[PDB]
From Swiss-Prot, chain A:
It holds the Pfam family DUF2498. It comes from Shigella flexneri. It comes from the Bacteria. Gene3D superfamilies: Protein of unknown function (DUF2498). InterPro entries: DUF2498, YciN_sf. This is Protein YciN. The gene is yciN.
Length: 80, 81
């Protein structure tokens, strides 16, 4: 529950490492399925899960992007 | 009855994938160059690619998404000192 202290310079360095990671992963991200579960779009695709089926560092970018798609596209479209 | 536009799965997926490719392209240009902590939440700042009048553009959306993701994940790990 407790967090670690960090300074501005070190935090920005790690933040920028995350951005570069996301940029890398995004080249492989593709929505391959969508349903509308109750007025909410849910996009599906390859989450880059590990061999045991668990999310990886790489998966985080997929969850973020698919949530963004649901959030934005659900406001303008309904699936027929 | 509704206020969204109807769309089929094929067209919807094409549109979602274009958004993904667009975010991919913009991310090449994204860098967090500032951070503060406000009411316990980290706030990252940098170039939002605002238009000449200071308003968000389509390109800006990728930055807002990425910086929110950073605030959400890093605030749970760290606090700024
Ligand atoms: Cl309809
Ligand atoms: Na925190």
């Amino acid at each position: 529950k407790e967090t670690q202290p960090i300074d501005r310079e070190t935090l920005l360095k790690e933040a920028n490492k995350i951005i570069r990671e996301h940029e890398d992963t995004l080249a492989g991200i593709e929505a391959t399925g969508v349903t509308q579960r109750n007025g909410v779009l849910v996009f599906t695709g390859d989450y880059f899960l590990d061999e045991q089926g668990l999310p990886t560092a790489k998966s985080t970018a997929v969850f973020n992007m698919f949530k963004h798609l649901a959030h934005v596209l659900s406001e303008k479209y309904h699936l027929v």
